[PDB]
Amino acid sequence: TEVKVIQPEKSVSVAAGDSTVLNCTLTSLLPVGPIRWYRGVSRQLIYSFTTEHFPRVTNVATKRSNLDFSIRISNVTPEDAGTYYCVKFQRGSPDTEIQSGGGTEVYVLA
């Protein structure tokens, strides 16, 4: 019954200059630990979340949005093509990766 990292799209096609969304959701925020996005597996860190939250009042959350770790790439360039993994870690000294999504490949059109 451990946490699952869900990347629903095996691939996304995007025109250069357009924006795209890489979807990732988790079934839980536990155990505490960041969610990070990598290109490749070698791999390149591109985005990171904590499971902490901003004060709720400054949001103008839901069960689903609290678990949505999707990222956007704006103004896509050919060098954005590749496979992107959403990865959940347990917090520690140091953190250890516990689960990875299945990868989403980004196809960039001219």
Partner: peptide, 15 residues
């Protein structure tokens, strides 16, 4: 840079 989170519930950062 050109990377952002869809949701702003959890603090997040590129890199």
């Amino acid at each position: 840079x050109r990377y952002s989170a869809v949701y702003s519930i959890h603090p997040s950062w590129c890199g």
